[PDB]
C-alpha cells in the first residue's frame, strides 16, 4: 500500500490505553528537535492536518542533559500550567542549543522573566502540586512506550511515527509528509 506498517510508522506490540490523540516527545537539549521545532515547524503543521476534535499534547523528556534535563521537564510543566508554550519554546531551544545561556534552573526562569511572566508567578508555579503532577504525566507518558529516543510522536496510543523511511532532501516535502501521516493514522 501507500502507507505500510514498518516503513512510515510502526505499530506498538503493547498498545498503551487512554493516551493522547496525538502525543509528541522533545527535549531542549535534542538537536532533531531544535529543528522540527525551529526549521520545520512540525507540531505546527501536524496541527493544521488534524481533523475537528483531536487535541494535541507535547510533552518534554528526562534522559538528555542529566540534571538540567529534568530541570526542563518541570519548566516545561509550568510552561503548560500557564499556557506559555508559545512564547518560552523559542528562547528555551535558542538558550540550550545555540547561544549555550541556559546552564542552571535560574537561567531557565529569566527565560521566562524575559517572556513576561512574573517571578513570583513563576515560582508559585514551579513549586505547586499542580505542576508536580503535570510533571508525573510526562513521565508516565514516556514511560508508557519505552521511550529512549527524540523527536518522537504517538497517534492514539498504538502508532510511532517513522520520519527515517521519507525524503529528507526537501524539507517542505519532507513535513507534509510526515502530517499528512499523522492525519491517515489519525484517520485509522
Given at each position: 500500500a501507500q502507507y505500510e506498517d514498518g516503513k512510515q510508522y510502526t505499530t506498538l506490540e503493547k498498545p498503551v490505553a487512554g493516551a493522547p490523540q496525538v502525543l509528541e516527545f522533545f527535549s531542549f537539549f535534542c538537536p532533531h528537535c531544535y529543528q522540527f521545532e525551529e526549521v520545520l515547524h512540525i507540531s505546527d503543521n501536524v496541527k493544521k492536518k488534524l481533523p475537528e476534535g483531536v487535541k494535541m499534547t507535547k510533552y518534554h523528556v528526562?534522559?538528555?542533559?542529566g540534571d538540567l534535563g529534568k530541570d526542563l521537564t518541570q519548566a516545561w510543566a509550568v510552561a503548560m500550567a500557564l499556557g506559555v508554550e508559545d512564547k518560552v519554546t523559542v528562547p528555551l531551544f535558542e538558550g540550550v542549543?545555540?547561544?549555550?545561556?541556559?546552564?542552571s534552573a535560574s537561567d531557565i526562569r529569566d527565560v521566562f522573566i524575559n517572556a513576561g511572566i512574573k517571578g513570583e508567578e513563576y515560582d508559585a508555579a514551579w513549586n505547586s502540586f499542580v505542576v508536580k503532577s503535570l510533571v508525573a504525566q510526562q513521565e508516565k507518558a514516556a514511560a508508557d512506550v519505552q521511550l529512549?529516543?527524540?523527536?518522537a510522536m504517538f497517534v492514539n496510543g498504538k502508532y510511532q511515527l517513522n520520519?527515517?523511511?521519507?525524503?529528507?532532501?526537501?524539507m517542505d516535502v519532507f513535513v507534509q509528509q510526515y502530517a499528512d501521516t499523522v492525519k491517515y493514522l489519525s484517520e485509522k
Open positions: 528526562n534522559f538528555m542533559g542549543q545555540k547561544t549555550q545561556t541556559i546552564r529512549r529516543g527524540v523527536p520520519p527515517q523511511g521519507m525524503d529528507t532532501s526537501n
